Each structure stands twice: as structure tokens, then as C-alpha cells.
Amino acid sequence: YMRALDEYYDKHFTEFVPLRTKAKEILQEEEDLAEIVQLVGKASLAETDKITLEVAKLIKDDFLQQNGYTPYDRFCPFYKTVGMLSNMISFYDMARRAVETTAQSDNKITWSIIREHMGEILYKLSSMKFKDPVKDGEAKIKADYAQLLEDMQNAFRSLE
Amino acid sequence: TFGYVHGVSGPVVTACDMAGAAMYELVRVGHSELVGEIIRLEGDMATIQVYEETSGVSVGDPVLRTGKPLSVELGPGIMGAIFDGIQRPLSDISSQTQSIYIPRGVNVSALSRDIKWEFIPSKNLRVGSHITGGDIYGIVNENSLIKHKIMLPPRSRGSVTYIAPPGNYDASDVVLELEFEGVKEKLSMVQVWPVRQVRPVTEKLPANHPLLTGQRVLDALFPCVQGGTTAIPGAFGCGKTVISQSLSKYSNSDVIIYVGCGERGNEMSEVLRDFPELTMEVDGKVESIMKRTALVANTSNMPVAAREASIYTGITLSEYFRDMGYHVSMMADSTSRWAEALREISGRLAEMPADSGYPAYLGARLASFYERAGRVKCLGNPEREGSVSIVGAVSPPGGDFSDPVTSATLGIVQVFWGLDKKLAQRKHFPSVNWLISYSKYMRALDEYYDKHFTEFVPLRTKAKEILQEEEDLAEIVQLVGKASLAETDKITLEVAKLIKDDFLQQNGYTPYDRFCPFYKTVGMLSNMISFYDMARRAVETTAQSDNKITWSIIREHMGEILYKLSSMKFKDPVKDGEAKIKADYAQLLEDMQNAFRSLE
Amino acid sequence: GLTSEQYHSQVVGKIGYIARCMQTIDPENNLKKIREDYQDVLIWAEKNYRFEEILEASKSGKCPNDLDALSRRSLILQELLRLVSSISPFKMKLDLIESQYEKMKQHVNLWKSDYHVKLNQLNQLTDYLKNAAPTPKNNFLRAMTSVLQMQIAQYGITEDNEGINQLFKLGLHLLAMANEKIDEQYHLFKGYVKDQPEESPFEGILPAEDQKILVKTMIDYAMPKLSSKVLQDKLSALSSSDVLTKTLLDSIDRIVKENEKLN
Amino acid sequence: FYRLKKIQEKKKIIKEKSE
Amino acid sequence: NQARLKVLRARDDLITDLLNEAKQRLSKVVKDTTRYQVLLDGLVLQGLYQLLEPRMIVRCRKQDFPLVKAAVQKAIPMYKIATKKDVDVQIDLEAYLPEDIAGGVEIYNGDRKIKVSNTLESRLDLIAQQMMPEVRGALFGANANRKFLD
Amino acid sequence: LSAEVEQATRRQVQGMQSSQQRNRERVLTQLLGMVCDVRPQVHPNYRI
Amino acid sequence: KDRIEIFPSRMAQTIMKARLKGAQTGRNLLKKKSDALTLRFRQILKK
Amino acid sequence: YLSQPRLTYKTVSGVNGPLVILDHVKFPRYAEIVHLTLPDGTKRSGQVLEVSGSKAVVQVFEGTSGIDAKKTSCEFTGDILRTPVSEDMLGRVFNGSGKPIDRGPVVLAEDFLDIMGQPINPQCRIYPEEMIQTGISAIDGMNSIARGQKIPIFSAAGLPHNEIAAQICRQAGLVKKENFAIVFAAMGVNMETARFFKSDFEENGSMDNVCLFLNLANDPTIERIITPRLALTTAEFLAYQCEKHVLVILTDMSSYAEALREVSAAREEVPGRRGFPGYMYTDLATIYERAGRVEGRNGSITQIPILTMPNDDITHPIPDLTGYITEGQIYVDRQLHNRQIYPPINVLPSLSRLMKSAIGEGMTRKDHADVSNQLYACYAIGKDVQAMKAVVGEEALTSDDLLYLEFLQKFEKNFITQGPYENRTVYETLDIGWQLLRIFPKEMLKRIPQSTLSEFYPR
């Protein structure tokens, strides 16, 4: 039903379809990389592969993992879903941009540098799932996710 | 005479009023006369497996009772004919019906009864002369190539009461009459033989003569014998077409019978398009191989009984032309498809599924089919000797030789020419892998080689050992590289390459080595093994000296000799007669001896 | 192998076939040795036994019924009959026929013998010439094969005659040689003629008319290469010869060679 | 397959019994 | 697509008009007493031949009862001659066909569980549906693309 | 072009009507002639 | 021993086919690793 | 013509599953089409599955629910199922049994053809030769289809094999360096996908060529059995009589195999291999082999069966026998699908046996074969280099390995990845192939003869 739902998404959640496409691509890349990480080793991975693996862990553990017994995650509104996925994919794209652009350059950037610099950003992306629509209204959740995006952009601008 | 349809369900038609019907007999059901086989009897109720689609067959429809089981119709007109697995003359059905389909329940005679044949009776035969089954009582000039010898059927005998004078006769004309115990038999030029019954012969002699094909790899390393049994892998890029063409054009077989036995539509269309166009030079004239070839061609949508009986119709025609004194070469294009048809028939009959779904008798059927191949002292008075060489190909699933059909075929057959797609990609034609291939007729052909080609056997053994050594050294090359190889090992590798690229490899399109006479093949192998032996001798006998010889030294000194060895292929058997090619190879050997003597 | 009924039917048929072969090879009852050797099987053909009666005799064992021995003897007679028939126009002396019969009987295995192979080659040639249309290749083949048949009749196939071997080799090579290779055919025939010890290889063997056709064929191939009208008239005069001769071929060759030199 | 074939045979025999 | 379907609908309506005219013309053919008598004889005998039961009941329109009776009288002997089978043929005088039917008959067996409808409506429909290729070719011309008929 | 499609449809309908009118009489004559022509006959499989 | 001792079943057949493909992929990757190591090893030996 | 009246029977002896066993039938005909009226007037169709004595076991197309003895009538039409075929059924939507479902009129027959047809004579079939371009680069430039080939598509449940089928139907045509038609048969296709097919073909403007047969999942299964035969009878009429190159797309042959299994169980036959009929090979051959060029006729029938490989098992009887009967395969990959590549056609396991007959000078172009071979070789090397890079690391790779990785990425992004409505002429496909081959220098294109590189490599 994705093809039939394209019309609904491109009018109500215009930005969601590319986010879903990139999320599926990232998950498949992680599936392809885990076989190799476990068969041979983790040392030979490129920086972009590390971004893919760690963003896939982020998405799997804190976007595709939903405990339905909690007050905050019993039902996740689609605005919450699309906002969370937008933040995760924005982080993915921007981190890949950093590592690729600084490749073949003196001030090289690696996944370790990003993780060490902004452990707070990763923690906030992880806690994004805790927003409770009942008390954290739609406007509040959207504003918080926009603030997270702003913090991500600022921290990457400082890194760059 | 006539039964009636009492019930119909799928292809199974139950017919009443069939008291006298015989098991496995053939019947014509319906008003369109669909072919059917009696597979059961119960009182007057005969159960019939109808070959063709039974839609429209209604209760009360007449069932004509053919008084024979599935029997091929043997006689003049076989040569150049295209038959279904049931003996339906596709080339005549298409002409008479002017349609692209095979009409349901077509009843066209297998051999034309209107065409006239020039029949010359045996000069010795008269009125009262004693005649016996298998006796040739006349010859028909079917082609400029094949003289069709008209023979009495087996199980027939007596004293001749009328033998026709030489003249033009058709298959319906009575050409002979005989009497035995007062019973008078009138024999036309066409007989009929059950396909599933082995045609009798006075004796089944051992196979002791090669089935030459012209391909050096097949003729030399893995020889087949007239009356042999061979298997060929069936794949996309394997190159079975080279084997089929070589057997059809250049082999010493007097006759060729090609059995489709259930090929794809366009795959069979390719064969029907190509085989008529192939030509062979006989008596200096370029005749068509269809003057001596028959095609039992049927695609995968034909009646399953047609596909399953294709092998038997082909082998019965081949046995017929063996009994005439000829050497026939039957080629089942893929026995795997025949085995699938057999499994389908078993499933339709609801028989217990044996190993991996195949029937409980697949091995027995394959063995009994391949047992019909061989060289025989043909039945009949004129002392003859014929043979049937079955070259039936098989299709291993994904290259696995472990399925029931491939396993049974490899257990039964005595030769395996193991075509490989890997070598085809490497552009090594013919693509016989020359490592998985094998031939169990070497001990049978030892006598023939020792009589005509005394030196061939040691040459072949040495060539095979060279190739095995090269295969074993391929791993050592990986482990330690080429620089770590001894001089003897370098010689082995660089003569194994010579044999691979300049002896086994052969281009079927060139005018010079499209067909390689066995004398040429043995000459080339003799020169190659002579080079190998003298190089090895030089290396071994200079290992004790400080001026030790190396393969590099020999190559530098005798690049000319190596070039001549590579160019031995390019001798034309036609223009460069046997004498000239032999003399040139002897001169080459003289030059190698001179060069080695000077170097050593 | 064979059921008893069919085995004894084969025995009867083979006795009849041996009788027919004897009748065909020696209708005049001149091959006394052979007929004596085949007396035990020809006795059942001399008297008018019906198939049923002779079959009963074979079943009882009264008549020879060892189908392997009958096959061997029938083949010994059949190869001799083939030898006699392949040279049909050229009869063979009774002494020669009897000697070759003894040689065939002595042979261990006829179906692998050199005599059988030589007969197969001669039969190839005879069969081809039985229907081939008149052409230079076919005329050359007929001439060489007729000479070969004469040599076979006058010597026999049970020896290593160099003349017969040469004729076999050349005839088979010409037969296998392509139809259009006119030059190769003509030079093969010319080489054979030049290598025959006799000056007139085909004299008395072929009819005078076939001699004339053969010389006409040689002249036809010689003419188109000539340029001098005087030597062309000489060639035309030579074409009037009624017999082919080695010296006549040499004269034609010299005519064409002087024409070449004059060119 | 054996069980189903046996069941079919028994059904045929029962049908004959009823007929 | 709508235009293609509309022209096809127009063609189908023309065919339906032709078949309605055929119905209305058969309803006038029935009024020819001699021709309708011959037709009724044919239809009754045809139903008898299709059915082949020992006992038969012919159902027909009330106004057609005389003719049908005559037909039966003519069919009983011919049938006996053609099949060699003794036959009884009654005419249902208690339940006739609807008066608005064009004509024809309906032959039931003794127990009425097998019926053969030889009414002019059914016969015309059965003939026309098989004729449709010929009617198409004649009314709207043959297909220039169709080169082979087999 | 939509009006062109409509006009083409109308032209096709008129052509069909004319081609019908041309052969309608013979079509109907043949159809009714073969409807009236009965030819009663028993089933071919009937045997006595 | 000879067999993994998974009870015959279509699920078991699928699991074993997946395991065979995974083992073959791991073998090929380790063979490529060995090829790279051997190439560098022979380069260092020549050096 | 059948002039005799139809016989109607109230002698229903029994009802069992989908079967109505009637008794006292006059010379029952096997496979007869029979129209039965229920007690309440509902009309249904049926086919005489089996015949015995005076009995007749009628498999009803619809269910037997509501059918009863003593009141259900059953009129035997006296003839087997014959379909009305014409050229006007090109641009129409029919259900499984041939009844139009586009609100158009019933087919005004040009002929009445038996659906089972007859086997094309092997001696009359001709080698397919020229090419039918589907507009899809992944199969035009690497698995091209000859005029007369039978090349199935293999996929699993959930992959876009139906979307690829619709794309091929919308774009299929002759190379073009009005004699083409498409006969789309959909079997066991849920309502959503049937509506997708119908609306797509209607909207995209290709309906003038397409005859569409839709057998929904909840439509009778015997209708599913007779759907491919209707489609191929129409294809044979259009190709071998109207002389136009037909392309038959038979969707979800797995659903057809399921219907075949259901009918076999209805006949009370024992299951064969993996639960399917033993004669499934013959039935699939009967369907597929109604294809190919023929002697003396300018039309043809190409076939593209589509299969849902159950459990992604290539050894399953349906894909196995289809590969045994057909002449190629186009693999729809779950990995490419997950990576969001469309069409997710994997070109390594896919194959087209008769590609060589469908390419070359005068058919597609001089360089088609060489470009295809080089593209396949470079793609395989690129996959190998990805596997190597995964072990050695990006730095350890040589320049040629980087070139191969770049070609792999740009090949999956430009050649394979196409988009549903991107129709590429085979010349466009070859131009893209050359754009991708110009990543490497002339020397690494070892599978392209220099005669071709000197002409097409530059620019």
C-alpha cells in the first residue's frame, strides 16, 4: 500500500517518503554489514559503514523498538513517528556528509570523533521516543524535535 | 472390432464392449480417433490412457481397436523424415493439413503409401526358395546414399511363392508372398515392430571398432566404439551441438537417428532448422545428411506418451537400420526429459513414488534401453554385421550428477564426454573437460589400436598422465609460484599447455581441422609426446652437469620447433593428403631430433 | 539369443542361402572341391524338401544345425561369391576360384580380413560406377576400375599384388576427390597411366568406343591450353586415335608444352 | 501418498459395497 | 477508451436490433398455417429424437394445440421407424406454454425431469449465437487483417 | 482534439449503420431460412 | 559428526540452506582475506 | 452448427463439494459446458469434470451452495467451452471466463475457438529471431527477449513483479529502428492489484494494444484454470491469423498452479510432488508452448510468465518446471527491492537463452552483445570488489577496484534503477550502458572487440 499511500503522504507528510526510503536503505545496509562484521572483523570498516551501523542501531533500538505498555509509547501518533524518523535521517545524512567531505583532507572526521563530541545529541535522539503525546502536546513534541535538529546542526557546524 | 466409450475422466477413457482387447494395445477413441493405450482390463471394460486431449469425447463414441501395441512402422521413407514420438510424420501432417498445428486425432500414415520406390528383388530368390526372418529379399534405392534393403520381419519364415519383378512399387503393394505350414503371408515393403520389443539378432558381438567423430579429444583420449553407449551433459553453453554435428556429418555411422524426446519449442525448432541444412561430402559430392538421417522430434507440449515412447521409437528405427547391415548412431537429445515424461506417466497411473518421485522402474527402463545399443551379427541369411551407438545426452540439475536419471545413466553408459560451460567461456572448443570425461572402451579398442595404430595407446596414456600432472601442479603453482617449479615440472606444464591449446582445442569451422582423421590425430600426439620425452630426457641427463639444461634454454633454442608443433593443426587432410601430412610430421620429428641432438 | 523355433528357422534359411550362393557362383557344377565341402548342406537343397520338412530335420539334428558353423561356412561362400560378382564381366579361372576359396576357408576371421576390406573397396567403386553419369571423373574411375577388375580376375585378392594395391589406392582417392577438381582428377589419371608398366593400359580391357571417349576426354582437357593452330590440328589428329596409349598421352603433353613455350 | 492411496481404494470398495 | 467502448456498444445494439427483428419476423412466419405446420412437425420430431424416452409429453401454446397434435400424429410413426423403439407421446392439455411465446414446443419425459425446449425463441437464440461470426462478417464486412482462418 | 475524437466516433457509428443497412436483408433472409430448415436427426452415438 | 541433528522438516531444510549459504560466504570472505595476506606476505618476502 | 435443442435435466443425483452429479444424461460429453438454474432462479455455469455411463459430474464454476436435488435444473449446452475471438477484443477487459467487465458489449465473434487449442507443429515453428523491447534497461540491454521466446519472471511474495508486469505491458513494443499487441492474463490477483492493472492500462493510453483478462483471487478457481487458455487462444488468433506480434504476460503462475491443485483434488487424484499434480509439467508445457514464430506467418507470440517463488525456493515444482519448459528467467531480488531499487531485477542469476537471436545488426544494433557481455562482467567484478573491500578496507583497494566499485554504484543507480514510467528505447539502454562502460579505460573492456570500442567508446 505504499504506492497508494504516496498521494496521502505527499499532501499531509510531504517529507516522510524519502525518510522511509533512507531508513529502509540503512537497515538493509546494516543487514549486509553485520554478516561481514561477525564473519571477519570490525577493523576494516570504512567511516561511512560505521555511520550506517550506528545509525541502524539507533533506528532499531529507539525508532523500531516500541514498548506498548508504557504511558508514552502505547500509541505513537504519526506526527511523532515522522518527526523522529526525520531527526534520525537528518543526523544520518549530515554525519555522512561530514565524514565524506573531510575524507581526503587533513582534518579528517571519523565516527569516533562525532560520537565523542556529541554524546548528548545521541542521547537526545535516543530519548526522543519518550515524548508522551498525552501531556507533551503535538506542538510541544514538534518544537522539541525541531530544537533537537537545531542542536544537531549547530554541533555539526562547530565540528565542521 | 468396435468398442464404445463408457466413461471419461481426464485422459482416462473407460470403454465397454472391448472383450477381446489386449493389454497395452493401441485404440482410436472418439470420432476424431484420439490415440489411446489400454492400461487395464476388467471383464469387457478396458481402461485406456488417451494420449491426446479428451475434451469433447462423449459416452457412446466408437473406439476402434488397433490390433497392435505401440508399434513403429518400418520401411522406405524413414530417411529424411521428421517423426513425432508416436511415429506421426510432422513434415507430412503440416503439408497435408496446411496448418501450423497438429490436428487432434490425426491419422496420417507414417510412411507415404502414394510415393513410388524403385525395388530390385534379390536375384537368387525364386518361387519355392526357403526364406527366413531377417533375409533381404530386395533392395530399394531410397537415396543416392542409403540403399534400403527390404528384409523379412523377424518371426516370419517360409517358402517364397511370389517375388515381385524389379519395378516401381509403393508401401501398399505386395512385393513378396511366402507360405509356411500352408498359411500364406503377403509382405509389402513396410513392416511394423513394437517399439518396446528388442529386435532379434543372431548374436550380439563385442564392440571392437571406434566410432570416429573427428574431434581429437573425443577420438583420442575418450574413444567410443561402434555399438557403444555415451552420455553428454545438457546445458546452455556446453556445446552438445558440436557433438551432434560431428556425429551427423563426419562420423563413420552409416545412419543417424536424432531423438528429441521432449525438448523446448524453440530448442527443437533450432534442431529442425539446422539438421536439414547440414551437408556431408560423399564420393566427392556434397549431399545432405538428411539423406541418411531421421528425426524423432517432439516438443514439451506433445502427448506425454509421445515423449516417453520417443526413445523407444528412435531405438527401434535404429535397430531396424542396424538389421539392414548399417552402423546407426542414435542420439537422445535429453534423456532427462524422457525420464520426466516417465515420471508424469507414473503419477498419472498413481503408482508408488520411488526415489525422488521417479517411478519404481527408472533404472530398469534406462538399462533396458541402453542394452539395445551394441554391435550385432544381423539376423537373416546374407551375413551382415550392424551396430547401434547410443549417444543419449542427460541434464544434471545445476551440474549435479547425483539425481536418479544422471546416476542411472552414468552407471549404465560406458563413455562420458562431459562437456563444460567453463571451457566454453574460456573459448576452449570442443568444451570436453578432459578431466571428468571417461571412456571404458579403451581395453576393447586395444586390439584395434595395436593392429592399425600400434603406437597410439602409449601416446594416449602419456598424454593423459601429462594432463593429470598439470592439474596436480596447478595447486603447487598457487602455493609456491612458477619460479619454484623444477625443470621437469616446467616441461610438463608447458607441454600440457601445448596439448590443451593445440591438440585438444579444435575449431570446427576451419577447412583444415573441422574433421581430423585419426592418422592426423595420432601423428600430432606422437610429435607432442616425442617433444615431451626428449625434453625430459635432456633435462634429466643434464641435471648431473654444471651446464644443466632448463626449459627456458630449450624454448630459446627451439622456438621454431615449438611453433611447428603448434602449427601441426593447420595441415589440411584434403589438400595435404595422408601421405603428405605423415611425411611432414616425420620431417618435423627429424628436425626435433636434430635440434635436441645438437643441444644435448 | 534366439528362441529354439527361430534358431531352427535360421538354420533352414542359412541352408537355403548356402544353396542359392552355390547355384549363383557355380551354375555349371565346375567347382567340385567347393561343392564337395558343402555337400552336407547342399544335399537338402538338391532334393525338394519343403521348409517344414527341412525345419523338422534341423530340429531333429539330422541336418547341419550348428548355426555358428553354418554362419562361418555361409560367409566363406558369400565372400567368394562377392569376389566373383565384383568382376562379373571378367571371369576367373576355376583354379583361381578354388585357391581363393581355400584361402578364405583358412582365414581366421573373414569379417576382419584384408580380403574383405579389398572386396569392400572394389564394391564401393563398382556401386558408384553403376549409376554415376558420364563425366571426366566417372570415365577415369570406370577405366581404372575395369583394369582393377581384370587384375583381380587374373591374380585374385588373396595376396599383396602391388598393381592391385596401387589401383585400389588411386581409385579410392579419385572417388573421394571432389567432383569439381577437374585438374586434380586429370593429373591423378595421368599419373596412373604414366605409372602403368604397359604402354596401353586400357587396350582390350575397355571397349573400343569407351577407349575413344577416354581419349576424347583427354583431348578435351588438352585443347583449351593450346595457342598454335598447327599444334592444335596435330592434337585434333591425335584425337582420332581409337586406343589410349602412354606414348599418345606423352605426345599430347609435349604438344601442350611446346604451345606453352611458344607463348 | 500410501495412506491416501489406501483411503482411495477403501472408498472405492465401500462404493462397490453400496452398489 | 470510452469512445471505443461506445462504438462497440453501437455495434452490439445493431446486432440486438437485428435479432429483435428476427424474433418479430418469426412471430409472423408462425401465422402461415402450412409453413407453421411443417415447422411444428420438424420441431416435435426433433425433440423426440433428442429425448429418446419411452413416454413423452409435448407442451405447446393453446392456439397451436391442433397443429401440434397433427405433428405428434406424424412424429410417432416416423420416430418408431427411425429408432425402432415403441413410444407413447401425449400432449399436456393441463399446462400450456405462455401465450406470448413465438411458438414451438417443449418435450418432457414421462416424469418431466428431462425437458427439450424447441420453442422458436430458444431455437432462434441458439442459431443466432452460433451464426454471430457470419452475421458479423456480412453486416460489418470481413476483417482485412485476418489473413488465415486456421 | 476531444471533439475530433467524438466526431470520429460518430463517423464510425454512421459507417457501421450504413454497412449494416447494405447487407441486413440478406443476413436476415439467410438466418431465418436456416432457422426454419430443421433437419431432425438422432444422436450419432445412438445404435440399434 | 555427520549430521547437525536437526529434525527433518521444511523449516529445517530452509534453515540448513541458509546456514550453508552463510558458511560459503564466510569461507569466500576468509579466502579473500587469506589471498590479501598472502599477497602482502610474498611482497614482504621479496622485499 | 449445432441445430439440435439443448437438453435440460432435473435429474440431479447428488451434490458434493463443487460437483453436481447428474444422472440419466443422454450421451454425456466430457468437458461439456452446462448452465444450471438454482431453485431461486440464480444461474450458474459448470463444466463436465467426469463422465460415466449415464452420469455426469458437473464442476460448477461458482459454488454448489444453494443447489439441491428435485428442483435444480441443468441445461447441457452440447459443446465444449468455445470462446469468441476477434480483433475487437484488443482494448477490452474480460474476467477469467471471458465476460467483459469494462461495461462494454459482449465480444462479437470473428471466430469461435476451442480454448484448449492444439500443439503448434514442431516442423512449423521457426526460431524466434528479432527482439521485443520492453522499455526496461535491466532486460532490454542484458536479457533481451526474442520474438517467440518464453522467458519467465521469477519473484517472491511482496516483490514488485506485478508492477514490472504492468510496466512491460505499458512499454512493450518492437524495436522501431500497428502490428503489435499484448494479451495480459492475471490469475489469482487480489482486487487491489486487478484494479491497479485495469486503471493503469486505461490511464496510460496503451489499452489500444492490450487485451486484459482478470481473474481475481475470490473468483472461481476453474475460471483461473481457463483464464490462461482464453488468453493464449486470443494470442494465437491475433498472431497466427491476424499476423501481429503478440506478447502474453501471464501473472502469478503460482496461483494457476494452486487452481490446478484444487481441480486435481476435486477429481479425487492423489497429490503429486510437493502436493501438486503429477501432470503439472504437461499442463505448464501446454500453456507455455503455445508460443513462438511459425512458418509462413508474420505473427508471433512471446511469453513472459510471472511466478511467485514460494519461500524463495528455486527448487519448488512450479519454478522448477517453468525453468524446464521456458527459455530464460528474470529474477526479481529481495535485496535490491529492500535497497529501494526499481526495477529490482538482478542481472547475475537472470538469463535469456535466446538473447543472441534478439540482438545484433539490423535487430537492435551492432554493439548490443558486446555491451551486454562487458556490463555483466563488470557488474560481477564490482560485486566481487565490494566483497573484497569489506575485508581489506577501502585504502587497500587498487585504482581498478575503485573503478569497479564506481561502475557498480552507477550501474545500479542508472542502468537498473529506472522508475515505473521511464520508457527507454533499446538504443537509450545501450547509450546508458556505454556511459557506464566509459568509466573504465579502453583496455579494461576486454570483452568488447576493438572493432566495437573504436566506434562506440569515444564521446
UniProtKB/Swiss-Prot annotation, chain E:
Location of this chain's protein in the cell: Apical cell membrane; Cytoplasmic vesicle, Secretory vesicle, Synaptic vesicle membrane; Cytoplasmic vesicle, Clathrin-coated vesicle membrane
GO molecular function, one term: proton-transporting ATPase activity, rotational mechanism
Chief localization: membrane
Tissue distribution of the protein: Expressed in brain (at protein level).
Keywords for this protein: Acetylation, Cell membrane, Cytoplasmic vesicle, Hydrogen ion transport, Ion transport, Membrane, Phosphoprotein, Synapse, Transport
Function: Subunit of the V1 complex of vacuolar(H+)-ATPase (V-ATPase), a multisubunit enzyme composed of a peripheral complex (V1) that hydrolyzes ATP and a membrane integral complex (V0) that translocates protons. V-ATPase is responsible for acidifying and maintaining the pH of intracellular compartments and in some cell types, is targeted to the plasma membrane, where it is responsible for acidifying the extracellular environment.
Entry similarity comment: Belongs to the V-ATPase E subunit family.
Subunit field text: V-ATPase is a heteromultimeric enzyme made up of two complexes: the ATP-hydrolytic V1 complex and the proton translocation V0 complex. The V1 complex consists of three catalytic AB heterodimers that form a heterohexamer, three peripheral stalks each consisting of EG heterodimers, one central rotor including subunits D and F, and the regulatory subunits C and H. The proton translocation complex V0 consists of the proton transport subunit a, a ring of proteolipid subunits c9c'', rotary subunit d, subunits e and f, and the accessory subunits ATP6AP1/Ac45 and ATP6AP2/PRR.
Protein known as: V-type proton ATPase subunit E 1
Gene (name only): Atp6v1e1
From Swiss-Prot, chain H:
Binding residue positions for ATP: 353
CDD domains: ATP-synt_V_A-type_beta_C, ATP-synt_V_A-type_beta_N, V_A-ATPase_B
PROSITE patterns: ATPASE_ALPHA_BETA
Topology class, membrane: Peripheral membrane protein
An MF annotation (GO) of this entry: ATP binding
UniProt main location, coarse: membrane
InterPro entries per the UniProt record, alphabetical: ATP-synt_VA_C, ATPase_a/bsu_AS, ATPase_F1/V1/A1_a/bsu_N, ATPase_F1/V1/A1_a/bsu_nucl-bd, ATPase_V1-cplx_bsu, P-loop_NTPase, V-ATPase_su_B/beta
Known partners and oligomeric status: V-ATPase is a heteromultimeric enzyme made up of two complexes: the ATP-hydrolytic V1 complex and the proton translocation V0 complex. The V1 complex consists of three catalytic AB heterodimers that form a heterohexamer, three peripheral stalks each consisting of EG heterodimers, one central rotor including subunits D and F, and the regulatory subunits C and H. The proton translocation complex V0 consists of the proton transport subunit a, a ring of proteolipid subunits c9c'', rotary subunit d, subunits e and f, and the accessory subunits ATP6AP1/Ac45 and ATP6AP2/PRR.
NCBIfam families reported for this sequence: PRK04196.1 (NF003235), V-ATPase_V1_B (TIGR01040)
Family: Belongs to the ATPase alpha/beta chains family.
Protein name: V-type proton ATPase subunit B, brain isoform
Organism: Rattus norvegicus (Rat)
